[PDB]
Paper text:
Here, it is reported that multiple zinc ions can easily be charged onto the surface of proteins with no intrinsic zinc-binding site by using zinc-containing solutions. Here, we show that the surface of proteins can be charged with zinc ions and that the anomalous signals from these zinc ions can be used for structure determination of proteins. In conclusion, we demonstrated that protein crystals grown in the presence of zinc ions or soaked in a zinc-containing solution are easily charged with multiple zinc ions on the protein surface and that they are suitable for zinc SAD/MAD phasing. Considering the high phasing effectiveness and multiple zinc-binding sites, we believe that zinc derivatization of the protein surface is a largely unnoticed but promising method for phase determination of protein crystals.
Recently, we obtained crystals of TON_0340 in a precipitant solution containing zinc acetate. The TON_0340 crystals, which contained six molecules per asymmetric unit, belonged to the tetragonal space group P43212, with unit-cell parameters a = b = 107.44, c = 355.03 Å. Additionally, three zinc ions bound to a cluster of six acidic residues were located in a putative active-site cleft.
Author numbering: 12 to 269
């Protein structure tokens, strides 16, 4: 994925400490964190496999830190997250929250319409708006994305339009106070947890079973964004790599803590 890798370069370059600032924000607003995930995929419009895992990892982290969390997603994701007994948001309001994080959620475009990486208009109720309001209310917001059309990429629309195919049409306009860019959004999410762990002195990703979570949500019906099929994978990449990255993170964390 040349495009996003260039965007990361451009971004990290001038926003060198973005993951760190993001993690400070996280660690300072755990009272009541709202986690939004779920990215429908045209044409079937079924929620993708990338996103819910990160959302879960963060959720488990907020609790381990003595905070409360709720997830706001689509039907299918709720179904797939059930086995993990996650607290769902019932008719959420910006004001009710301490922090609102987004892991791979469609972000409104300059059109005012939603688009897939292939530029197919996403047609489903958006989970977009609460972030706009949260912005106006000055409520702490964190967005994690890996393609330029997600919630929070509004902060670097220029980079997106400048390197990502279909940029002008696809790039989201929605901004977030802090933004994590990654090759795969769940990874960025694991980065947040990883960085937070280091700052706190405990490995919050300790028992994360990447394979067990992806196979799980996959069985429930969450598809793979690229193959658009029911494969135990994420963004067209097999578990082997995803496991390799989660193992590395866990390692970097123990290296700092101990
Ligand atoms: Zn550039
Ligand atoms: Zn209320
Ligand atoms: Zn194309
Ligand atoms: Zn994405
Ligand atoms: Zn992705
Ligand atoms: Zn620090
Ligand atoms: Zn995807």
């Amino acid at each position: 994925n040349r495009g996003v890798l260039k965007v990361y370069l451009d971004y990290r370059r001038k926003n060198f400490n973005f993951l760190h600032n993001s993690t400070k924000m996280f660690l300072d607003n755990l009272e009541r964190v709202l986690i939004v995930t779920g990215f429908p995929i045209p044409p079937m419009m079924v929620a993708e496999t990338d996103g819910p895992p990160g959302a879960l990892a963060i959720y488990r982290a907020v609790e381990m830190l003595g905070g409360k969390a709720e997830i706001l997603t689509y039907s299918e994701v709720e179904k797939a997250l059930e086995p993990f007994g996650v607290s769902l948001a019932r008719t959420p309001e910006p004001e009710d929250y301490s922090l609102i994080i987004s892991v791979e959620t469609p972000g409104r475009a300059a059109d005012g319409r939603y688009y897939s990486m292939s530029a197919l208009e996403i047609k489903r109720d958006p989970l977009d708006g609460i972030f706009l309001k949260a912005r106006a209310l000055g409520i702490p917001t964190i967005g994690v994305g890996d393609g330029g059309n997600e919630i929070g990429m509004g902060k670097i629309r220029e980079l997106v339009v400048g390197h990502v195919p279909h940029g002008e049409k696809i790039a989201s306009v929605v901004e977030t106070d802090e933004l994590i860019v990654s090759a795969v959004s769940n990874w960025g999410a694991y980065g947040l947890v990883a960085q937070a762990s280091i700052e706190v002195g405990r490995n919050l990703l300790e028992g994360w079973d990447e394979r067990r979570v992806i196979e799980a949500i996959s069985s429930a019906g969450l598809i793979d964004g690229v193959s658009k099929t029911l494969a135990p994978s994420v963004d067209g990449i097999r578990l082997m790599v995803h496991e390799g990255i989660v193992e590395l993170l866990k390692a970097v964390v123990d290296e700092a803590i101990l």
